[PDB]
Amino acid sequence: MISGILASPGIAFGKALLLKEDEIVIDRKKISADQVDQEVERFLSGRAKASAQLETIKTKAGETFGEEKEAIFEGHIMLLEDEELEQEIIALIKDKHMTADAAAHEVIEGQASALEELDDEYLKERAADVRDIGKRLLRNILGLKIIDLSAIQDEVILVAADLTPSETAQLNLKKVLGFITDAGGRTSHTSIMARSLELPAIVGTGSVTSQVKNDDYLILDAVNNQVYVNPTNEVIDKMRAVQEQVASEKAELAKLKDLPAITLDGHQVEVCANIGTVRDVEGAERNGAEGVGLYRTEFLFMDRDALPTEEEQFAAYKAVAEACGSQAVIVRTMDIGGDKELPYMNFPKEENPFLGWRAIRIAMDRREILRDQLRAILRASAFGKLRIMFPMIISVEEVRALRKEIEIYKQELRDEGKAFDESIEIGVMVETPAAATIARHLAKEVDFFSIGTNDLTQYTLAVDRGNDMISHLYQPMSPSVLNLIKQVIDASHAEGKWTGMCGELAGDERATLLLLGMGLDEFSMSAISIPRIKKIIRNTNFEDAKVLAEQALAQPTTDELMTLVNKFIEEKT
Amino acid sequence: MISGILASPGIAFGKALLLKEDEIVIDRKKISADQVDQEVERFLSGRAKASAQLETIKTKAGETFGEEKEAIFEGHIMLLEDEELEQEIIALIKDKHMTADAAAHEVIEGQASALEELDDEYLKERAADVRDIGKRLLRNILGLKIIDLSAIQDEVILVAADLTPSETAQLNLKKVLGFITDAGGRTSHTSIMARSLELPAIVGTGSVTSQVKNDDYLILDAVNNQVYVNPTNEVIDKMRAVQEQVASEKAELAKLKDLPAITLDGHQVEVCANIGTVRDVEGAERNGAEGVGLYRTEFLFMDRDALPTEEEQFAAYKAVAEACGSQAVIVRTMDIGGDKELPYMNFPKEENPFLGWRAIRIAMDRREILRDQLRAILRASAFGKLRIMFPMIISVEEVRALRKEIEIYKQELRDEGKAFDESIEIGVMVETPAAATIARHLAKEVDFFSIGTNDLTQYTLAVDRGNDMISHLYQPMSPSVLNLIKQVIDASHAEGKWTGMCGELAGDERATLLLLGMGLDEFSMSAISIPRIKKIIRNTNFEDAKVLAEQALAQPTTDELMTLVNKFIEEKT
């Protein structure tokens, strides 16, 4: 009867691999002066190896996982070569006549020890990565035999007390049919990989490695949360059928709108990622995004030290469109100028950037910007489902002037023998109280809306998103912002269009029932929030939420509206 | 058959005074070197007189009109003593060997001449005041006889081709039964005085002074726009009866609420002045204000180099309350922190002051400020009708916390044996889209609303009131702001309260029919706008305006809403 936390559901059958590591012996024997010069050379000679061996691991991470994991090694390597460590490690040996393995341990342990004093779980984990660098350094000076998880010639299950980020890079994903460890829990780096990799694995076993020997045959239920050791065929069979169900579950979920973004009583919404860069598509796919709800194109502009031309934009958009496969991306035209300047533009300062010459106000005062970009988006739409959406819309005037612009850019493309999706849908950010107010009018003029609650909150409450001194007044969960949200959604629906939401409220656990009840069609968020919200959605009853929403919309006070939400959560799941 | 522009309606009977002035002779005869030293002394000796005589006129203006007219003389005197004039006047005489009256004329004429090159009517008038200083200087060096309007021992009518601001100060208001001149028109300084003084007078006669001799008996109709010269008693009689009607008109208008702020079809609104300082009460009374709709207390705070204590505030408020007589003042608690900092507070900088720690957000983070002030207002309410109004309100939370505050401060006063109007009404600025959105909720909690459209526009459109680069987007006449205005007014009325407006829209000729049609109860503006708006109000039909308003509120476009307004003005007066 062994149970863990189960990080990924599924089933698997294979041999068990056990990572055994010998304890590192440290000699506290003081060294003589003649040994001072020799110990430094041993450290440099031992450090010389890890230098080249660490570099080899980096290259495997880049090809195996990508640049996201390749740079983490550079930080560890760059930190190791820090000139502060060279002087501090040598000084103790030269000054205290200590050994290199004992003196070096104090330096890396000293810094990591300072990090543990921190009262944050996020800073403590990084201290674990730093500690790992010094831990291996001691083995490197001694020249301890390394197992290396890359030397696997046969498929096996991976069992260990805990895995350090360094092992996950040089790990064979195809030869490992799963991962099992007794680490702390999801807060473990390897645990997150099981989720994104979508492979069965446990991390809270507690003491399975002490019960398993290498070459042991084990079957992972990852469904009943049980492990069978050398079990007959009656269990190897049950499991095999459990694995069948698992596979059918995929096959069914595989359907289009038949996704978890459905309440108990059958109400579906989209749930998507906001992104900045192709690189974010990875997190989106990892977290179960059904498409991209907001492609903040600014971020691509701050990914460069020059304004990206039509061609550079096109390429960037094309990549995204393609890295998204079948999925739709809502490409927002550029929003520079509140707290998001791009320095390379050298725009002049403003007294209130957030009430200033922002986003569309620029692209309309400098058509080359609007034109290059819209041109690029359109052209990229020849390569995947894209939508166009505009930021900082304030009037019907603005929308018509920009549609007219699209139509001009569309013809030019037609005339230059350049495909673009003629179906391409156009919408607007509703993130201004103006837009919210004339939502009915705007809804005739666009295909859709996405409510930017970060901004909407900001202007409706006149509280600067940046200003910590008044942060306590920044409440997107005000009777004032909610009402304006409702009013927008309703506008959508009255024209037979839809409203999504890319403001942070979409991703906020506390609004999910209200957003849902109020009929929001689409949620778009940081990818990392997709599962929390999906979970809430999948476990609500939609009808109940409507009732909730309605109540909340009548409250003159946030507190009073928080109460409704809470009594709901109490009574309803 | 002589007709002028009539600046003030009324009737008068009295003798005619004629201001005759001899032409100033200028000698272009070059002076010798021995005469250079003597001419400078003559200028200094002649300048010595005007120095003391100009100072005497200043003291008469202060006692006669007040500090508003006393400082204008200091500028003229300070400009005359400018060290640049001393060196430039002496240099030409010493360098060009010119005469003091001819050389001095070039210096003052030279600067005034540069001002005329300006293409602005407002800058040109000031050039007239500077020209006057040099014109009299020539008489002062020559020692020309001065008539002085203060030497009047008998009541007479004042007739002149044109009067310079200097004469208006040393003018006997009680001995002058009216003012008649052939100047340009209302753009004449003296013409404005007839309006504020409320005395019959003409400024566009054209050539009456050439037809009148001093000691002539004239009757001013100022009603039929005619002047009778030595007319029998049949006309001295008609006029006397015309004067009776005039007096009855006052008596009727005198009433109270039934004033000019009434549409043709009987709909009344209040029309008041926004003020900053007791000193503004004068302009308000001058321009026919029926009370004060917004007393921006910040302005009193920027009228000082220290934070005004409870006692200083009280005094300041008391004065206002009293300078307003029977009239109600809406005292807004302090609004510092957008474009209105007070430097003496040394508050820290903000990234977006207008979305920052503004107004009520301060007084709530520093109770001493809120307390002193509310204390002071309450106590001042023992001395005249005052209301309390709060700026930058965003939530029902804020209002309740502040009412609760009032109630505490009320008791303290009760306990310290300090009267305050127990009837004192409390309201809120609706100048946030939040407030506008929860207007229904807020309306239960306050006695009234005043819509701040400067701010409301700002946040609804996210356009900084300060930012000229996007000024073209600052449109309080958007379908978005108007709708929010309507929604607020309606909230008021639904609770049986009222909404006023102190934003600049109230004073904007183009909104007046809409504001009216939408049922706005109260308008408050710069005093100078009171008559334009009153005029529009008095000449509208209210029912028609409703229809107008309604139409305008359905337009998705400003232009389209401007069209309605225009076709109205065409067809309707």
Swiss-Prot record, chains A, B:
Residues modified as Phosphotyrosine: Y122
Annotated binding of Mg(2+), by residue: E431, D455
EC number(s) given by UniProt: 2.7.3.9
Protein's cellular compartments: Cytoplasm
General remark: The reaction takes place in three steps, mediated by a phosphocarrier histidine residue located on the surface of the central domain. The two first partial reactions are catalyzed at an active site located on the N-terminal domain, and the third partial reaction is catalyzed at an active site located on the C-terminal domain. For catalytic turnover, the central domain swivels from the concave surface of the N-terminal domain to that of the C-terminal domain.
Active-site residues, Swiss-Prot/TrEMBL: H189 (tele-phosphohistidine intermediate), C502 (proton donor)
Reactions performed catalytically: L-histidyl-[protein] + phosphoenolpyruvate = N(pros)-phospho-L-histidyl-[protein] + pyruvate
Organism: Escherichia coli (strain K12)
Disulfide pattern: none
Reported modifications of this chain: Phosphorylated on Tyr-122. Phosphorylation on Tyr-122 is important for polar localization but not for interaction with TmaR and for activity.
Cofactor(s) needed for function: Mg(2+)
Protein name from the UniProt record: Phosphoenolpyruvate-protein phosphotransferase
Coiled-coil ranges (or none): none
UniProt entry keywords in alphabetical sequence: Cytoplasm, Kinase, Magnesium, Metal-binding, Phosphoprotein, Phosphotransferase system, Sugar transport, Transferase, Transport
